[PDB]
Amino acid sequence: TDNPDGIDYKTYDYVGVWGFSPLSNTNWFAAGSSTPGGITDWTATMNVNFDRIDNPSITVQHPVQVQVTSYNNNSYRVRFNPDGPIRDVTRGPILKQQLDWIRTQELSEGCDPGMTFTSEGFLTFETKDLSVIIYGNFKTRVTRKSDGKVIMENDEVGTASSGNKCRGLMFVDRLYGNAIASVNKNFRNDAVKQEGFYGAGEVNCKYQDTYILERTGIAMTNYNYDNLNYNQWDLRPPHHDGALNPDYYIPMYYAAPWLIVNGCAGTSEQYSYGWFMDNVSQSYMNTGDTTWNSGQEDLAYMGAQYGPFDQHFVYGAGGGMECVVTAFSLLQGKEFENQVLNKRSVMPPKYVFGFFQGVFGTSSLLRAHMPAGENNISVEEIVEGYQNNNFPFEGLAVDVDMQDNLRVFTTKGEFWTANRVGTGGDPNNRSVFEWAHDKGLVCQTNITCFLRNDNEGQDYEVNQTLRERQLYTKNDSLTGTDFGMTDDGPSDAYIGHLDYGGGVECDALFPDWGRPDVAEWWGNNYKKLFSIGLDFVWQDMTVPAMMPHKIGDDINVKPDGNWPNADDPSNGQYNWKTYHPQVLVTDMRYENHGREPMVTQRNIHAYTLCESTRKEGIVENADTLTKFRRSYIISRGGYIGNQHFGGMWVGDNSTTSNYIQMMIANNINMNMSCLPLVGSDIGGFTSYDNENQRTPCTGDLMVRYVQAGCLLPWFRNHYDRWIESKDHGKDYQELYMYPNEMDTLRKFVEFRYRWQEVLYTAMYQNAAFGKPIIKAASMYNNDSNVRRAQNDHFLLGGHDGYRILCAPVVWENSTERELYLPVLTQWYKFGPDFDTKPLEGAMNGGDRIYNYPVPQSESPIFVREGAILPTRYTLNGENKSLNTYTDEDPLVFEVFPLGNNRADGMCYLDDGGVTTNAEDNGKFSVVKVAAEQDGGTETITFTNDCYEYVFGGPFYVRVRGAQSPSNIHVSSGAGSQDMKVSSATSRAALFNDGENGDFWVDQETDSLWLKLPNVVLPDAVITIT
Ligand SMILES: *[C@@H]1O[C@](F)(CO)[C@@H](O)[C@H](O)[C@H]1O
């Protein structure tokens, strides 16, 4: 059943943005003419005549479907398949079942797009806010009803005398290629529109010496790659001389063929729309880049090395770019499964939002069992460092260090307290994971999908059962290529090589995911780790990232680093640091469809692995999860839709200012690509000192890395540690190792911890509504200076999610940055210090301050007026891990000074992942709160949208700017009472000794604190006179 559509696969190698050239026309079909082919449901068919642009008399016919995906969220989809019948994918971000659910709802509401073929054969339809017309050759014009603004149009190219052809639909003549593309007009250069292009997952873009957010006027590709430092030498453009910097034309680890167009920014006539080309082969996004003649200033396009053509234009229901993100998340939603919680992404345990230390280069659990070696460290020393120094510290990322000879799902004795491997639950021989629980910590460990093959006759159950059950990727191809062999066998398996550097290496078999049976087998392996105490998963080398390898060479030999290149091309011999792209993998996109070569689907492999880990690993074997039944995944690779599996970190960065800059950019961009739980290793993973690789990250840079990283969804210090037996990396990188800075390091980790409910509530907003956690500055509306500030200003938190403004310093040795504060709202300077002193004066929005002061000990962070922020504290005043908090650790609603006499706030509550009942059975609570000021009366009102989780402890209201009241009355379903002044005179005394119904007048910080019983949380009216 192999290659059932009978494709000739013409291209196998990587093809850079310099080798992708739609606008060249030659050898390309474009849409020339059409006739109507009927409408069923919301899907119209046009029978399109494609004409060779360079020889229009050469013509083919393929049916093209136009589908209104959502009326209310203003979205439609265009799809065809030049190579076979049009097929629904069985796996991927956009499934038919969910499209079907959306339409079913909207139909039941009386939504009617009114899709019609005119008598001229023109296709027209409407959405809530938009009207669309497609002419005979596919020329498409999308107009906004309110003002009649044309907000999108596709591209036509002229011919001599054969008429205009629409390059909105393009495919290369299958005689010469397999490629596809689609071209729009691009108003980047319009004096009024000034179209901007945002999104694109992980792409890095340099402008001068600074890394920037926007993705306008550049040629990008999606080509999941083992891209260490984001600049792998083999990724260089042809004939490139000198240092290759990370930059826009280099693929990353995430595959996001997705862009948000945004025009007329900061005006009432603003428009935004997303553009998704659902394709998992190498794909491309060009936003008007003339470099290599890849594009034209006034044209934007997307395309891909292989078919089929499936594309989505997503305008959203409301004004602003965020509405585009939510609508997109809607389209990939799980409402069709009746998810009570995980609608648009999956909720993590609370513990995911804590501060995690990873290290590549640990050698034991305990100091007493650490093998002697230069600069060797034990897991124990790391925990002591953080705990003895009172760091809020969550746990560890344990690396391949703990495995038995790189065998995934194993451990070796050095990583047990008794120095031998046990089966778990033995109190006189604890694994690293068990010992870590007893420290109040949780752990992620490193899982790759390489199953060690060279075992020297020694038994390794995972590889054996992979072999025995024939679940591995075979070594078959259509090209008759020799992928290689070893003495281990099997005679018919793909065999790759894992290389960590420094002799840390092995042969590996791999799972052929598209096979039915593979996913069940994979997920079950995790039992071996969950049962010895493992809490969550850190997914690595997911490409799958293999050692560079040229066909012909022995399996363990890499090619010269300079190869391949322009003068010495791969010519289908380079493996491209993954599977040799010729290999026949069982179809991941279509179940029951045979095998295609991996070139067709490279960017789905990671998504598929995370999927299998999620469904068959974290979910189906939840029984064996020890301390928390909810688990999470942090992946290195993936594809749009990964959020229903977990989050991401941006693989191997490094320790320079630029990588701070890139980390902010990535985090913002990845968020608006609907992957919100993301971060980059804090301190950079790799060595950065060219003279001596072991020099550790400086104190100032770490401070800034930390200040920048501290509110981003995923906060981990991880690094390559130099050790005798793995002689690459730095000496150390842990926050406790910085005496001069410790007091600044510690407080920002504290600050984070205090806003643990701000982060977790945003995560709720994402799971339920798809709001991204981190907002690009351009998502703030009706402001025409945010575009300029968007590189390093990002928003988060609160009821709407624009309550906190961050503007980290992004340069080592700098005590200033230019600061922009969004217009028509007031800001309050805040940070780690302000919890224990009064707020300063309000700052006006729309102020640009050049050279705004930021000492090393500070970071620019502002809370907006009208914010009420849930805030946590330990009862005993010591710093502890998120995971060992209980409801007797105070929950405090901090009410900031009011905006237009009001403030609002929201808080999500569940058992934090202890069980999965919030997401299986609806066991969570959504508290809302509001403050209003009338004359001399202030009313603070608690309501709920559901209260199915009982907050088992007292809670507080902290009114900023309020002092002593004449009276406070509390009215609630149960306790209607007047409050009294506590006999407590300090905050620690009010927490521990204060009675429910006590208030405290806090002069030192100009706050009024109210202590309230747990039972009045879900519904209450507080009137202060
Ligand atoms: C995978 O490879 C490692 F370097 C070693 O397992 C990790 O430490 C790294 O974070 C990841 O890219």
Side-chain angles (χ1 to χ4, degrees):
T1 81
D2 275 10
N3 193 13
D5 290 334
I7 318 262
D8 207 61
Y9 307 91
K10 305 290 195 152
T11 314
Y12 280 112
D13 285 309
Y14 174 51
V15 173
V17 299
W18 45 85
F20 199 73
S21 48
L23 309 181
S24 260
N25 309 327
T26 54
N27 272 7
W28 286 78
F29 284 103
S33 63
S34 69
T35 40
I39 316 166
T40 21
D41 296 326
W42 289 355
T43 302
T45 296
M46 306 187 81
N47 296 316
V48 176
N49 298 303
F50 294 88
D51 300 329
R52 282 268 313 268
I53 308 173
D54 58 332
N55 198 342
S57 74
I58 305 173
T59 191
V60 281
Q61 198 188 15
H62 298 296
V64 178
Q65 292 182 10
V66 171
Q67 181 172 358
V68 177
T69 57
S70 169
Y71 180 93
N72 280 334
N73 303 279
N74 298 301
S75 58
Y76 74 103
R77 157 210 211 190
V78 182
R79 82 208 277 206
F80 73 104
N81 181 6
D83 298 297
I86 295 171
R87 223 141 23 210
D88 293 316
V89 300
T90 42
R91 176 187 275 117
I94 312 270
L95 305 161
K96 177 191 134 75
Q97 308 89 296
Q98 171 71 1
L99 291 190
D100 282 355
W101 182 89
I102 292 164
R103 181 179 64 260
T104 302
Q105 292 301 282
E106 286 174 359
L107 282 163
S108 84
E109 288 174 29
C111 299
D112 187 27
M115 313 196 79
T116 171
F117 283 112
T118 65
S119 72
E120 309 81 4
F122 305 153
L123 174 62
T124 59
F125 63 85
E126 287 197 359
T127 69
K128 169 176 121 70
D129 289 294
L130 299 180
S131 54
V132 194
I133 177 157
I134 311 186
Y135 296 105
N137 65 348
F138 232 82
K139 167 77 211 192
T140 296
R141 276 213 188 253
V142 181
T143 299
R144 181 174 62 195
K145 295 162 193 192
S146 43
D147 58 1
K149 216 178 231 293
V150 161
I151 49 183
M152 196 225 307
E153 44 178 312
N154 64 4
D155 184 70
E156 303 171 286
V157 76
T159 56
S161 66
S162 289
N164 299 124
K165 317 281 159 200
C166 200
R167 296 191 289 194
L169 313 172
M170 304 184 70
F171 65 92
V172 174
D173 193 316
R174 273 44 189 152
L175 278 184
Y176 307 88
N178 308 99
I180 64 166
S182 158
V183 191
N184 284 352
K185 279 184 87 178
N186 175 338
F187 308 93
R188 66 179 293 215
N189 282 342
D190 188 287
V192 196
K193 304 203 192 170
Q194 284 168 94
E195 286 200 342
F197 282 93
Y198 295 92
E202 278 159 356
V203 169
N204 308 297
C205 193
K206 214 183 184 185
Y207 180 68
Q208 317 203 257
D209 312 299
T210 308
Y211 282 78
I212 66 163
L213 186 55
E214 203 158 318
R215 295 282 172 277
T216 315
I218 63 156
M220 302 163 282
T221 182
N222 296 296
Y223 194 71
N224 296 344
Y225 214 76
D226 201 2
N227 193 15
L228 186 143
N229 283 167
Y230 312 160
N231 67 346
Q232 274 304 295
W233 191 235
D234 50 353
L235 302 171
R236 69 196 185 280
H239 300 114
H240 180 85
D241 281 314
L244 176 60
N245 290 347
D247 218 341
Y248 64 80
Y249 48 86
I250 306 185
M252 291 282 285
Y253 298 100
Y254 204 42
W258 161 249
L259 288 171
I260 309 175
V261 183
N262 186 57
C264 300
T267 55
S268 32
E269 55 157 40
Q270 188 189 316
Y271 60 96
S272 319
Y273 69 87
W275 179 357
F276 175 49
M277 176 170 274
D278 204 351
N279 198 291
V280 294
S281 83
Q282 185 172 356
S283 80
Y284 301 89
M285 301 132 301
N286 191 302
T287 53
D289 190 13
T290 61
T291 307
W292 309 285
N293 213 46
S294 59
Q296 301 168 205
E297 285 189 10
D298 309 313
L299 297 182
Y301 70 82
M302 288 218 190
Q305 276 303 317
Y306 284 81
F309 185 100
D310 189 3
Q311 190 171 232
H312 283 92
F313 300 103
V314 183
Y315 285 71
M321 302 181 54
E322 209 208 322
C323 293
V324 162
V325 179
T326 61
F328 190 32
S329 82
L330 179 55
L331 288 186
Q332 313 164 50
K334 299 305 165 180
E335 286 83 358
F336 85 91
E337 320 191 301
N338 306 298
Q339 292 296 338
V340 80
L341 179 57
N342 297 334
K343 278 169 175 63
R344 312 285 188 79
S345 74
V346 286
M347 290 277 308
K350 174 71 93 63
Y351 66 62
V352 164
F353 287 125
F355 170 67
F356 282 92
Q357 179 66 46
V359 196
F360 184 28
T362 64
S363 58
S364 63
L365 177 57
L366 307 181
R367 291 163 166 290
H369 294 304
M370 196 190 77
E374 190 182 354
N375 200 57
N376 274 10
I377 196 150
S378 71
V379 178
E380 173 167 58
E381 181 180 349
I382 293 160
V383 177
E384 294 160 5
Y386 284 118
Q387 296 193 338
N388 296 333
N389 286 294
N390 194 34
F391 274 85
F393 171 65
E394 199 63 39
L396 300 125
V398 197
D399 222 319
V400 300
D401 305 339
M402 75 156 207
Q403 297 167 15
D404 181 20
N405 252 259
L406 306 167
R407 289 158 216 175
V408 68
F409 306 107
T410 68
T411 51
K412 58 188 184 196
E414 282 89 339
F415 282 81
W416 292 69
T417 62
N419 202 34
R420 69 165 206 285
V421 191
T423 56
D426 182 348
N428 301 315
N429 180 23
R430 289 171 283 169
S431 79
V432 44
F433 309 130
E434 276 154 352
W435 177 94
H437 289 149
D438 297 329
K439 289 282 167 146
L441 318 164
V442 300
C443 296
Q444 44 166 224
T445 192
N446 201 287
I447 315 302
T448 64
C449 81
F450 298 65
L451 304 313
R452 188 179 179 140
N453 199 50
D454 57 328
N455 300 303
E456 271 153 70
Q458 305 296 262
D459 304 340
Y460 170 40
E461 196 254 46
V462 182
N463 187 278
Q464 205 296 128
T465 52
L466 188 72
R467 280 172 175 258
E468 204 264 321
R469 284 181 64 196
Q470 291 205 35
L471 304 166
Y472 53 87
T473 307
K474 292 197 183 292
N475 56 355
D476 297 320
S477 61
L478 307 157
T479 48
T481 324
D482 194 321
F483 301 125
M485 195 31 57
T486 72
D487 303 289
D488 299 294
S491 79
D492 71 314
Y494 193 96
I495 310 179
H497 199 82
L498 200 51
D499 192 351
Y500 283 103
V504 182
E505 65 190 45
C506 72
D507 297 347
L509 306 194
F510 304 85
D512 195 8
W513 297 110
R515 293 159 178 282
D517 267 31
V518 170
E520 189 71 13
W521 176 90
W522 175 247
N524 268 342
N525 288 314
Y526 285 84
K527 276 192 295 163
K528 298 153 87 75
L529 289 162
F530 289 153
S531 73
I532 58 148
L534 173 69
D535 310 281
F536 67 131
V537 159
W538 160 35
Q539 212 96 250
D540 204 356
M541 319 287 289
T542 64
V543 172
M546 313 199 194
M547 185 195 62
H549 175 262
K550 174 184 169 225
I551 298 292
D553 291 3
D554 277 359
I555 290 191
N556 70 310
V557 169
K558 39 218 266 286
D560 184 326
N562 275 335
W563 189 90
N565 57 76
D567 306 318
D568 205 357
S570 153
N571 303 327
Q573 290 167 305
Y574 196 37
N575 76 340
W576 294 98
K577 289 175 170 175
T578 193
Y579 284 104
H580 280 280
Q582 293 64 31
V583 66
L584 290 178
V585 297
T586 303
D587 209 307
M588 285 174 293
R589 310 158 303 170
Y590 312 104
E591 71 196 12
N592 219 123
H593 192 75
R595 305 139 95 214
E596 311 267 295
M598 172 64 92
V599 74
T600 66
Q601 38 201 270
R602 166 197 196 101
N603 294 342
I604 210 187
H605 172 283
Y607 171 110
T608 298
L609 137 69
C610 292
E611 185 196 80
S612 289
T613 291
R614 179 63 188 151
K615 184 203 192 291
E616 280 93 3
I618 295 172
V619 159
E620 277 198 12
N621 288 275
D623 268 347
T624 80
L625 275 141
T626 57
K627 189 174 181 166
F628 303 83
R629 207 176 130 107
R630 192 183 298 163
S631 191
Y632 205 63
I633 299 166
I634 304 293
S635 206
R636 215 182 65 174
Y639 175 64
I640 290 286
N642 251 257
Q643 69 283 16
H644 298 101
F645 312 147
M648 304 285 294
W649 94 109
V650 203
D652 317 323
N653 61 337
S654 196
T655 300
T656 76
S657 301
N658 291 150
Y659 284 99
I660 295 192
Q661 285 153 57
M662 279 182 259
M663 166 202 73
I664 282 92
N666 297 138
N667 205 301
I668 296 165
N669 293 321
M670 275 283 285
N671 261 259
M672 67 168 90
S673 313
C674 298
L675 191 312
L677 232 181
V678 57
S680 321
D681 295 347
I682 302 307
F685 180 70
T686 61
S687 320
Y688 68 100
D689 179 8
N690 302 313
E691 302 291 294
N692 186 6
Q693 65 163 331
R694 304 176 63 183
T695 305
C697 174
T698 71
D700 183 79
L701 189 74
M702 177 71 64
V703 161
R704 299 307 193 190
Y705 232 124
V706 150
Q707 295 176 345
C710 77
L711 295 176
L712 307 192
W714 166 261
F715 193 47
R716 180 183 67 175
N717 189 307
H718 182 234
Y719 77 107
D720 195 22
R721 186 177 164 101
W722 190 108
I723 60 170
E724 195 174 301
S725 56
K726 184 193 65 51
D727 78 321
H728 49 87
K730 302 150 287 182
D731 279 336
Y732 62 84
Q733 193 157 293
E734 295 81 359
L735 304 181
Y736 59 87
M737 292 296 282
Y738 293 88
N740 253 184
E741 295 87 30
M742 216 185 291
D743 287 11
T744 297
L745 300 178
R746 179 170 50 234
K747 70 200 218 281
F748 282 77
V749 189
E750 272 163 10
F751 200 70
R752 177 184 189 79
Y753 272 55
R754 279 195 301 267
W755 280 350
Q756 80 187 264
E757 303 305 331
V758 165
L759 290 159
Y760 197 54
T761 288
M763 192 53 202
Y764 168 64
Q765 297 180 332
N766 189 267
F769 321 126
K771 293 156 71 38
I773 304 178
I774 305 301
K775 318 299 189 317
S778 41
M779 283 170 177
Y780 187 106
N781 291 323
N782 295 131
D783 183 321
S784 68
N785 297 110
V786 298
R787 204 186 166 170
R788 164 159 140 176
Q790 68 209 344
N791 284 332
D792 52 28
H793 296 45
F794 62 86
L795 307 105
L796 87 165
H799 56 109
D800 60 354
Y802 298 79
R803 289 297 116 179
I804 302 144
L805 170 82
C806 302
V809 166
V810 302
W811 295 103
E812 197 176 3
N813 305 136
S814 179
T815 58
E816 66 80 25
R817 64 110 69 253
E818 164 181 339
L819 177 68
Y820 186 69
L821 300 177
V823 70
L824 311 176
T825 194
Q826 312 272 118
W827 302 89
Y828 288 95
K829 176 158 178 213
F830 206 67
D833 300 305
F834 276 86
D835 184 53
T836 63
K837 78 192 179 173
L839 297 176
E840 290 175 10
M843 300 167 296
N844 306 346
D847 269 6
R848 203 169 276 280
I849 304 155
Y850 301 96
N851 302 310
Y852 172 89
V854 195
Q856 194 192 68
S857 74
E858 290 194 0
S859 193
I861 289 154
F862 306 86
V863 191
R864 194 169 172 176
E865 70 178 0
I868 297 171
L869 294 174
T871 315
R872 293 305 285 287
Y873 302 87
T874 65
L875 188 63
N876 64 6
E878 303 176 19
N879 297 332
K880 57 198 272 207
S881 53
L882 290 196
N883 83 73
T884 54
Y885 273 66
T886 66
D887 304 10
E888 321 280 332
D889 295 299
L891 164 51
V892 175
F893 296 88
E894 188 165 6
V895 181
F896 286 81
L898 315 190
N900 310 310
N901 301 316
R902 89 168 293 114
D904 295 276
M906 185 186 220
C907 185
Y908 165 93
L909 288 167
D910 69 6
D911 69 33
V914 177
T915 54
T916 56
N917 281 130
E919 56 263 50
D920 308 319
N921 297 112
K923 227 51 73 166
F924 57 94
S925 294
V926 186
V927 175
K928 293 199 185 162
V929 57
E932 269 194 64
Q933 186 83 41
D934 192 66
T937 306
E938 191 182 358
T939 305
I940 309 186
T941 312
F942 283 81
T943 60
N944 73 93
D945 285 14
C946 58
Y947 198 89
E948 210 82 75
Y949 170 80
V950 174
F951 187 73
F955 72 98
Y956 300 76
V957 176
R958 190 190 179 162
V959 185
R960 285 284 185 160
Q963 283 289 250
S964 180
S966 290
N967 185 254
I968 309 181
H969 185 83
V970 183
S971 164
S972 176
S976 175
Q977 196 196 256
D978 289 307
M979 292 183 94
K980 76 167 162 62
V981 56
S982 194
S983 51
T985 47
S986 84
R987 183 201 300 186
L990 175 59
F991 289 167
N992 292 261
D993 309 323
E995 308 164 348
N996 297 357
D998 285 10
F999 66 81
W1000 171 50
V1001 175
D1002 175 2
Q1003 293 155 5
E1004 192 213 90
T1005 96
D1006 184 36
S1007 306
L1008 173 68
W1009 293 73
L1010 289 71
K1011 188 167 179 164
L1012 303 172
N1014 73 314
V1015 293
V1016 313
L1017 184 59
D1019 64 308
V1021 181
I1022 296 152
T1023 131
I1024 298 159
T1025 333

